[PDB]
Paper text:
In this case, the indolone derivatives would act as substrates, not inhibitors, of hQR2. In the present work, we demonstrated that the anti-malarial activity of indolone derivatives is linked to their ability to serve as hQR2 substrates knowing that QR1 is not expressed in the RBC.
Indolone-N-oxides (INODs) have antiplasmodial properties that target the asexual blood stage of Plasmodium falciparum (P. falciparum), with IC50 values (drug concentration required for 50% parasite growth inhibition in vitro = IC50) in the 1 to 100 nanomolar range. To confirm this interaction, we co-crystallized hQR2 with the chosen substrates, and subsequently determined the corresponding crystal structure. In this case, compounds 8′ and 10 were selected as representatives of the INOD and IND series, respectively, due to their high solubility in DMSO (solvent used to dissolve the compounds). Crystals of hQR2 in complex with flavin adenine dinucleotide (QR2-FAD) and bound to compound 8′ or to compound 10 adopted the orthorhombic lattice conformation (space group: P212121), with two molecules of hQR2-FAD and either compound 8′ or compound 10 per asymmetric unit. The ligands (compounds 8′ and 10) both occupied the same region of the protein; both were located above the FAD and interacted with the isoalloxazine ring through π–π stacking. The ligand residues could only be partially modeled in the electron density maps; in particular, no electron density was defined for the terminal anisolic ring, likely due to its flexibility and exposure to the solvent. Compounds 8′ and 10 did not establish direct interactions with the protein residues, but interacted with water molecules present in the vicinity of the binding site. The structural data clearly showed that these compounds lingered in the catalytic site of the hQR2 protein, comparable to previously obtained data on co-crystallized substrates and inhibitors of hQR2.
Numbering used by the authors:
A (entry chain B), B (entry chain A): 2 to 230
């Protein structure tokens, strides 16, 4: 069997992102996978990294260091329950799909907060214990992104540069760092500009890709893959 | 005269980031600049992009589109006061310094939320009306970042790649997109590993640089600057 967590970041159920998340649930459910969705806006997910994330006696209450305190809280089981609830979903998953609209060449802040707070030291990585030695080794991750900009804008000679350039902090700096193997991104370009048929086509391309997702190999998550030369 | 806004994202006043923000206030105040600080954690700044960002009635209450709603709310003066308070600070500033610890090769979510919610359509850019036609042309921006990783890790052949690789979404996709001219980043590597004297040196280098900040030329914010030789 296979277990999938979809971390979804869109405010509107009727959105293009909503449709891509729903087709993923529908297709992976049809295959017999175990599927969980973390709908961050509906959960009112807390994005801020604060001292409210630790319940116990702080390691250094005089000078608050978020990374030190969360690492110690993870080991002591004194983290806030909203974080540990997400960590259980990630621990059980074989594949984590992130479904989101691109905001400033990155994830919306609510989803950035999920990465900041859930992927803590001791859970997702250790120093040492990162990149190929990351604690989430054996798991797959996939970014399914939608954009305002067209595919042409997202080219080497386009005004936004190649789309792989903006993937570096997410695929490499975050997911590969935690040990994930990264599947090729799904980028659904400019659905707002797209015709009704073109939008339908992008939703079906995603559903069709998911039919054979378990046969895919991960990308080589390197600087050469992202930037060339 | 010169006006500066510092957007600061650290939970702890006694932190290394706190010291870099304080020396920036001290030095720019000494020069006679007008200085404002947005201390996002102390403000409990809201990072989530939600329908609470629009006061009164929505353009389309049946299907919520954040970008459409905020663009229309900006034009109709119906944005939440926390957003318009930041927009006034940015509008008045000649230079915007962002002071933050690197979180997942990017800004902490609270600061990502400031970028998502404050730099709205009609205020910072329009569609079309971006990059050289962005609405913050004439302003300068500067990223002052601290890291966990050493300078050696942030090299082309280092495990994290060149530090310029992670700057692309922030400097190009966000700041340049809105029309800012981007000053060279200030990167304070691994202060937690550094000695007491080493950290004092990093703080002093930032204060010293600020003495001549108004004489600096911006970087060429291009793909070649970020990814080339
Ligand atoms: C703060 C902010 C920052 C941004 N920064 C960037 C950036 O850096 N770069 C960039 O390129 N873009 C950026 N954008 C734009 C953003 O990425 C796009 O608006 C977003 O990706 C569009 O996806 P969506 O789901 O919201 O589209 P929607 O507006 O929800 O979808 C478009 C259309 O598809 C229709 N649709 C829904 N479901 C289906 C279906 N099943 N079949 C057919 N049609 C369907 C909808 O009804 C609608 O008409 C930014 C936006 C914001 C708000
Ligand atoms: C969610 C998360 C994600 C992260 N992702 C990344 C990543 O992608 N890449 C990466 O490289 N790092 C990453 N980090 C690490 C993070 O960037 C560093 O921990 C941070 O930059 C350290 O800066 P600081 O201000 O918090 O240091 P502090 O711990 O506050 O500073 C270290 C010391 O400086 C002392 N000090 C304060 N002021 C002075 C002064 N004036 N003179 C001398 N000493 C002084 C303090 O007392 C303290 O002992 C991440 C951390 C977290 C929590
Ligand atoms: C905040 O940054 C952004 C917001 C919305 C955006 C973008 C950046 C785009 O680049 C884009 C966009 C939409 C249509 C065409 N023709 C081009 C770009 N939208 O919507
Ligand atoms: C979330 O990603 C991160 C968090 C903290 C980090 C890093 C990444 C490092 O790479 C690092 C780090 C710590 C000690 C030595 N010797 C090197 C790097 N810290 O602290
Ligand atoms: Zn990688
Ligand atoms: Zn640029």
């Amino acid at each position: 069997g296979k277990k999938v967590l979809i971390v979804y970041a869109h405010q509107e159920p009727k959105s293009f992102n909503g449709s891509l998340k729903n087709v993923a649930v529908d297709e992976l459910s049809r295959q017999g996978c175990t599927v969980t969705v973390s709908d961050l806006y509906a959960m009112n997910f807390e994005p801020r990294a604060t001292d409210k994330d630790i319940t116990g006696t702080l390691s250094n209450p005089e000078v608050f260091n978020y990374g030190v305190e969360t690492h110690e809280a993870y080991k002591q089981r004194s983290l806030a329950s909203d974080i540990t609830d997400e960590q259980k979903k990630v621990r059980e998953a074989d594949l984590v799909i992130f479904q989101f609209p691109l905001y400033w060449f990155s994830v919306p802040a609510i989803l950035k907060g999920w990465m900041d707070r859930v992927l803590c030291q001791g859970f997702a990585f250790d120093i040492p214990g990162f990149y190929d030695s990351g604690l989430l080794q054996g798991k797959l991750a996939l970014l399914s992104v939608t954009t305002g900009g067209t595919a042409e804008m997202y080219t080497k000679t386009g005004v936004n540069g190649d789309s792989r350039y903006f993937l570096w902090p997410l695929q490499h700096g975050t997911l590969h760092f935690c040990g994930f193997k990264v599947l090729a991104p799904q980028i659904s370009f400019a659905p707002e500009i797209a015709s009704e048929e073109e939008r339908k086509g992008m939703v079906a391309a995603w559903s069709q890709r998911l039919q054979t997702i378990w046969k895919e190999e991960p990308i080589p998550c390197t600087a050469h893959w992202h930037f060339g030369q």
